[PDB]
Symmetry: C8
Subunit: 239 residues, 8 copies
Amino acid sequence: PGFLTAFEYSEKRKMVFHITTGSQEFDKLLGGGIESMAITEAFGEFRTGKTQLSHTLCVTAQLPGAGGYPGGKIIFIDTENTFRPDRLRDIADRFNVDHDAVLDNVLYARAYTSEHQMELLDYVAAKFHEEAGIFKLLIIDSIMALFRVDFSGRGELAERQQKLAQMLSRLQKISEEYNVAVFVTNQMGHILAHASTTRISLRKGRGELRIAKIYDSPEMPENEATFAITAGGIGDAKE
Amino acid sequence: PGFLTAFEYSEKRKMVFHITTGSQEFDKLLGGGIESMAITEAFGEFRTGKTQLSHTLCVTAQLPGAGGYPGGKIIFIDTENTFRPDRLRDIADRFNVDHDAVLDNVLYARAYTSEHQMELLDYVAAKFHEEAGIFKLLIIDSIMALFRVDFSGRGELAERQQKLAQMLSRLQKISEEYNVAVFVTNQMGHILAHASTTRISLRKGRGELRIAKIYDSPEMPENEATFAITAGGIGDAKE
Amino acid sequence: PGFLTAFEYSEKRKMVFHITTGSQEFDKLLGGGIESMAITEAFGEFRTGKTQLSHTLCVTAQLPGAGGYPGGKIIFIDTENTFRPDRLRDIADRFNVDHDAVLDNVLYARAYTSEHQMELLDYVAAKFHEEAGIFKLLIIDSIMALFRVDFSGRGELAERQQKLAQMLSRLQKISEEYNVAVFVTNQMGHILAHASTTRISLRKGRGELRIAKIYDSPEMPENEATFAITAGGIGDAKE
Amino acid sequence: PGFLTAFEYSEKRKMVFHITTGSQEFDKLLGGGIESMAITEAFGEFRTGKTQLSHTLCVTAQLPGAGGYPGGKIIFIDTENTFRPDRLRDIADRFNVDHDAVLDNVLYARAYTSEHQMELLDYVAAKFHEEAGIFKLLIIDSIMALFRVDFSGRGELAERQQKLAQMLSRLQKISEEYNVAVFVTNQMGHILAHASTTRISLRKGRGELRIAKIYDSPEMPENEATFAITAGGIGDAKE
Amino acid sequence: PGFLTAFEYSEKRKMVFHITTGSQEFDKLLGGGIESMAITEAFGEFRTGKTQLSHTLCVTAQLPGAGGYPGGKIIFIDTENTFRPDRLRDIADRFNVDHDAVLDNVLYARAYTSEHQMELLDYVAAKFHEEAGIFKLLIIDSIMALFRVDFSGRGELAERQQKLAQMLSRLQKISEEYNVAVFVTNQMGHILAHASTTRISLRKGRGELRIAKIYDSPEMPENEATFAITAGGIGDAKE
Amino acid sequence: PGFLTAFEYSEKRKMVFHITTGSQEFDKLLGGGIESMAITEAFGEFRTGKTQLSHTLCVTAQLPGAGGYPGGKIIFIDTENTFRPDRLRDIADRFNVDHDAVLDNVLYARAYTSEHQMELLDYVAAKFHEEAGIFKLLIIDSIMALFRVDFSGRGELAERQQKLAQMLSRLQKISEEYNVAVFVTNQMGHILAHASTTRISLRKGRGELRIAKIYDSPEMPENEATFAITAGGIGDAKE
Amino acid sequence: PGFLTAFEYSEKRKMVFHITTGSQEFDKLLGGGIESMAITEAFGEFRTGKTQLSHTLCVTAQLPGAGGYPGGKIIFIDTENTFRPDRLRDIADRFNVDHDAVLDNVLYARAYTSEHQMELLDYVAAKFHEEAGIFKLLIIDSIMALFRVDFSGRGELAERQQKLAQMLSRLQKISEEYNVAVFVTNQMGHILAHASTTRISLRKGRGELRIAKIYDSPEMPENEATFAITAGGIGDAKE
Amino acid sequence: PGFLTAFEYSEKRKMVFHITTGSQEFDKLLGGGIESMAITEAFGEFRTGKTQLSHTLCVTAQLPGAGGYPGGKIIFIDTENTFRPDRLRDIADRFNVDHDAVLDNVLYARAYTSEHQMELLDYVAAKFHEEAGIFKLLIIDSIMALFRVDFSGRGELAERQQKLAQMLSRLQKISEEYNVAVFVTNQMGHILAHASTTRISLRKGRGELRIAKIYDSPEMPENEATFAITAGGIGDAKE
């Protein structure tokens, strides 16, 4: 049938793995961190760490971890142009790992147009459908931002909202079907809400520390998560 | 004739069966719980149990019960992505039933687009028309939510309201004609009102307990229903 | 000629028969109750008896009565889905009549779409044109309600008001031409006014009793009608 | 020529005859009552006698009267559905005339649609063009009312005002050309003003009596007309 | 050439003749009365004599008068339907003239539609082009009034203002080219202003007398004209 | 080349001649009066002399005058219909000239439509291109007025402003190219401004005298011109 | 390549020559006066000298001057119609030069339509492309003014702004490519701003003197320029 | 694949070179100055140095400097028309370099239309794709300004915003792919924001000095940069 049983489905959910934020109190809000078969969004301020974090996971998703997560290659479509391999080699250190590796470990792609972006997504698939079990994360930062662009004024939102979900769906179908963890940064019943299953909001608690909270995610705790940031990516906020 | 007699019709209504909410005072508002040949809606808050309940019935509709209700397979189209087989095996327990069963007992399907959703509904039929008397519940949560999406702004509601009922009708025609009990969660003379014969409103009475009320349903009692929630699904609220 | 004489017409009006409301003071407002060759509308509140009454007449129109009214079969198109054969067998009693009869005595049909509804009306005809003198009532509750649905927002009322009367005319042409009594419930120079020759408004006078009044009908009395309701349908309100 | 001389025209006006209202002080406002080669309108309240009067003339136009008016057959297109042959036989009495006659004396036709209505008018002609001098009155009550219906909202008045006069002209061309007296009831430089040469306004002076006045008619008197109503139609209001 | 010289033109203006209003102080405002090769308009109140006057000239234009005006046949297109040959025979008297004559002396035509009206005007021509020097007046009352009708709401004035002048021009081209005197009644840089060369405004000075003034006409005097009205048409207002 | 030199152009400007207003202090504002190779406009009140003046020049442009102006034939397109040969013969007198002459001296043409008007202008050319040096003035009064007519409401000004200049250009191209003096009366960066090189405003200084001023014209003096009017056209205002 | 080097470009800029305003303090604001390979605009009041100045340069651009400017022929497209060869011969004097020369020295062309204007510009080219180094100035006064005309109301600015720059570009391409100095008068990020490289604003300092300032031009000084005007064009303002 | 690895990408970023502003405290804000594989924008006031700076870099990008930047040819598309080779030879001095060189060192192109501009950009490519490593800077000042032009009013921004990014993308694809440093001046989630990776805002600190700040750029410091300007381009602001 065009669908499977509950059992046969939970057969799959046993392959749900979390990718560490690199911040224990942050991973706790996500009860593990980034999840698979689920698009996760990054809510923030003008100056947010989402861009920083993206790299962090560019690696964590290589370091084996909890739940017997092996670690795997990655795809980093960069709409904005803030990707910095240099930041990577700066992190692999805090995790004591070969430089050329982490880098040989991340797939990079610049998103220019809002058609290019999906020109890409429909390709990310092929590479996932080619071989499987290798790619554990699909990080696109930021997805939206590039769409507010090619729009035809506040009169053609209709070609945008239509196009936006025409893909955000194709993004969902990837996540759960190919089993990976898709991360996404941006600054916006909004189509990119039901779309993303977990939404993290970010605020700054005075330079060093950052407060991560949830806007809407299954079993969402009322408490916040205090985390810090440094060269070595994201980590715990000590005394 | 393109229609049957009153007698010949009441011949059918004798096959109307209720599926337990798992909460006596809740089943009383529905005078049995979920009904057949009738779409039932779930009104709620940002954080409602409708999503939880859906699973509850994912099972109750397997446990034989009142009115000589046998129990049967099910179809759970999930628009939102909050279906959790794990929650099931956690309930079958409170009802002392084989795990692999309950699961082998539920048909799962993810709704991605608002066309996909009906691509599905027109199929749910085929499986119902293939063999009969097996499927006792059609649970779609949430039906609407996925439609507020593919819409073309607040200018093309016209393609939406048109499309929405183009199906909500096809949903009705299933319920009564194939005799099953269709449950539906959402958060909205509104097309999805005459559409659904029974509308349940949900409010939270301080974490543990929840107050279920009726917005509009035949022989609707003025009183509310106090029920609780736990791992084992929905149940009665004790002292 | 495409029309007949006054005499030849009054030849027909001698076949005008009233169908009892089951409430003497109610039948008096209608000077007999429901009339033939005339669409009668039911104005009411959120919780009105119109739905209850519909069944009442589902029978009364079988019990011979005043003006030498024989009694006959019936057609109950149900847009809403509140038809209850069970309620019937509960009434035939107060009128001491065979159960299987009353039921074998009513033609049932669910209205799903606003096209289906008329798909039906144009058929109700055929059955009336096939044989005559058998069907004494055409009860559609509610006619409107199902139309507020398939509409294309408050911008396409134009396809609705046009479609609505495209039928409400076909409803009139039935009533007078085939000589029957068409009853209709709903909650709205309004097209469904000139359309219906007799309009009854309903208000509730504290649970037990109900006050029926006229909004606009030939020889409309200024006085109201106090009637009650019970399992056995509609009846007089005693001390 | 496509027109005749003044003399040759006054040749025709000598065939102008009035049809009694049955109320002397009313006939005086019209200086005879209803006129020929002239559409007369009936302005009124929710509960007006125009509907009653229509029948009255259904007969008066059979009783020979002033100006050597013979009397003749009639055509009563009924848009509303309030025509009552019974009311006729109740009037012929006050005028001591055969029942079957008065009735055999009136041509009846129900107007359903706003196209039907004219489907009729263009036929009323044929019967007038067939033989002449027999039909002395063309009573359509109400003309407008049925048009406010098939309209396409307050946006397509343009198809209505256009259609309305497309006929109200065809109504005029009948009146003067075939020489008859067309009466019309309704409740509205308005197209149906220049259209109707004589406009009578109606108000109620406490149940029994009614006050008829003129809104706009050649040689319109400033005074009103006090008339009464009973089973025998319209008559004078005594002490 | 497509035009003539000033001399050759004044050759024509020597054929300019005035048609008496029947009121000396009125004829003085027009310095003779109605003029030829010039459309004259009649401005008035709800109850104006313009309709009365029209007949007056229906005759005066037969009585030889000043400037050696012979007198001639006439064309009275009647949009409104207030033409009364009877009123004529009532006037020919005050001018001591054969009845059958005056009447045999006026050409009558009812204007029904706004297309009919011009269907006529383009014909009035033919009769004027056929033979000449016979028809001295073209009286159309009222020209406008019939146009406010067939209009398509206040949205299609564009088909009206366009159509209106499409003719009012054809009316001008008649007046000066065929040399006659066109009179026109109505109640409105307005297209029907430059159109009409002489505009007379009418007010009522207490039943018997009427005050005629000018709104805009070559060599327009500041003074008014006091005139009366009776069976014999329009005349002077004595002590 | 598609243009000539400055010298070769001043070769032409030596043929620039003024046509007397008949009022010295008026001719001074125009430093000669009407000019050639230049459209002159007449701004005024409801009751202005522009219409009177038009005739005045109908002659002055025949009387040889200053700058060795010979005098010549003329073309008087009359949109309004106020041209009066009689007024001419009344002026030629004050200038002691043959009557039949002045008249044989003016070309007359009535403007009916706004298409006719230009139907004419494109012809005035032909007569100017046929022979030259004969026609010294092109007087059109009023140009605009006839255009406010055929317009399609305040929505189609676009067909009007477009059409208006489509000609007012063709009017300019005549003036300078054929060397004549075009006079124009009317009552309005307005298209008919850059269009007309000299704009004269007119006000009334108590019946007898009139005050002519300039709205916008090369070397426009701040002072006004006091002139009078009589049968003999326009002249100086004495003590 | 479709472009040249910086060197090869400065090769051209050595041919940049200024054309004297005839006012030293004015030439200083322009550091020489009018420039080449650059459109210069004239901002002013209702009564501005821009029209006067145009002639001034009609000559200055013939008088050799600073920077070894030889002097050359000129093209004066006149939209407005205020060009006066007479004013020229009045200036050549203050510069002691042959009259017939200065005039034989200026190319004249009247701009009638906004299509004609460019019909011209695309021709001014041909004459510049034919032979070179002869024409040193392209003076169009005023460019805009004629465009506010043929526009289709304030609704079709879109055909105007589009058309306006469709040319103002073709004007730029002339200036720099053929090396000349284009002067332009008018009265308005406005398309005719980036368009013109130097914008001069003009105010009047009491009849005799005028104050020239800059609105926006490379190296624009904060100071103003006091200049006078006389028959001999523009000159310095003495004590 | 349609994209490269992180390593293989950082392989490229090692070719990222900065081009000196000529102002140390300015280069510090950009941590080197202009960057490569990155469009840099210049925010300013009516009178900003962006135009001046453009030349400065027209050279600096020839002087070898930090990070082992060799120096190379350049492309200066000039929309505005303020490019001054003379200013160059005035700068090469402060950097002691051959004049003919610096100039032979810059590629010049005037942007006329908003289609021309891109007609160019798609060519700048060809010259970059022809040979590589020679052109180190692509300076377009100003990009926007020329677009506010050909727009079709505030109604067709839709053709503009669409067209604008249709290129600003093609500009990005050049920068990073061909490795150069694109500088851009102008005065405006705005499409030309995500578009440009580094945005510099400019304010004037009293004639001599200028304060450069950042509006939005990766690792944007809160501090400002005080720099000066002179004939020799941009430089440091001393005591």
